[PDB]
Amino acid sequence: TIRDEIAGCIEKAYEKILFTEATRILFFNTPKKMTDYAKKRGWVLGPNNYYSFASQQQKPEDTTIPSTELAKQVIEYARQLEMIV
């Protein structure tokens, strides 16, 4: 549960890390567990470095889940102000 704890917190701002410090922290000096992490995980086994890929959200379409959750919420405001029985 610490092995997958490093394998969870790897994906953060370790934008590049040299391999033998990950050998120190993870465990197992030159294992096939480096194949396990570098293949079951991402962190492309390049030259002496687990490389960090990039991913984005953009908040593009939504704009609409804001608009429809506001449809829900203001239909609710109007609904409770609406009541009369």
Added chain:
Amino acid sequence: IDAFRLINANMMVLGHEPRQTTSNLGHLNKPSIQALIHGLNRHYYSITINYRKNELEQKMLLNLHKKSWMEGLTLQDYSEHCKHNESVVKEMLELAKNYNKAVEEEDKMTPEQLAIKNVGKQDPKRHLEEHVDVLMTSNIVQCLAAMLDTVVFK
């Protein structure tokens, strides 16, 4: 609607009073006023008027006056309210905020003076709260702002 019927003068030796289906006469005396109508129950006896309506005509007058007060294609004026909600509303929102400061600092004197004068006696003077109407205009603001997401998106 008001309709009438003339009586003679030859038949005042005879009576004037069979009045079948008695409800109509007692109904005639209620829509009614005057001293002169009371003087013209002679020479005049009225007659009941009622109304039968075609459900075709009733339903298409309902079409007209519950649908044609909404306007053509029906999106048009609600998207025009959406045009109002980002260009014109903020000016009357400034008017609303200035009213809901200026009226308020003197209507906070009102429960004070309710504690001062009596338990709720007669009307002292001019002003009132009047905030409820301005809040209903603000409710118009929020409902037509809700219209923005619905109309503008999709």
